[PDB]
């Protein structure tokens, strides 16, 4: 804001935009898009049935779109380093990269960035470095608790 990046007259474009940060209050159901819209309005975070859709009547009935942090951070790379270059990163049906990693009784838990098409074994013995002493691979869950 002190550099003029938000507010009025953003580098002579004339587009008016402002951002506010709203802290949560500890509920897992708030992550859903319609429930996030309902909790943003100050009501109990109950989801909304489709129809209607949040692209038509979202926050306070206005057009409202909700995007993830990773999507909003992959947007500048797509916009600045071109579109066909972004298409030429991962050669699969899904184009782009993804924040990836393992957690729970492993040697090297953490977060890295991998393109699409990477097999799940290539994070075990290379990035995570395997598990601790005397542990057998019984199960794994790819996308969090859900």
């Amino acid at each position: 804001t002190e550099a003029g990046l938000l507010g009025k007259n953003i580098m002579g474009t004339g587009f008016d935009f402002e951002l506010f940060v709203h802290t949560g209050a500890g509920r897992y159901i708030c992550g859903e898009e319609t429930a996030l819209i309902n909790s943003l309005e100050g009501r109990r975070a109950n989801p909304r049935s489709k129809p209607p859709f949040p692209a038509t009547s979202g926050a306070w009935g206005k057009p409202t779109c909700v995007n993830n942090v990773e999507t909003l951070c992959n947007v500048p790379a797509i916009l600045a380093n071109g579109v066909e270059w972004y298409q030429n990163i991962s050669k699969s049906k899904d184009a782009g990269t993804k924040l990836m990693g393992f957690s729970g009784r492993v040697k090297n838990p953490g977060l890295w960035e991998l393109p699409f098409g990477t097999t799940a074994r290539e994070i075990l013995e290379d990035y995570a470095g395997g598990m601790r002493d005397g542990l057998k691979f019984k199960a794994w869950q790819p996308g969090g608790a859900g």
């Binding site: 506010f20 209050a25 909790s39 100050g42 306070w60």
Partner: peptide, 15 residues
């Protein structure tokens, strides 16, 4: 005044 609805400040007021 951050939001256009005073109901939207209920969670932040409680916090």
């Amino acid at each position: 005044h951050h939001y256009e609805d005073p109901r939207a400040a209920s969670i932040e007021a409680l916090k």
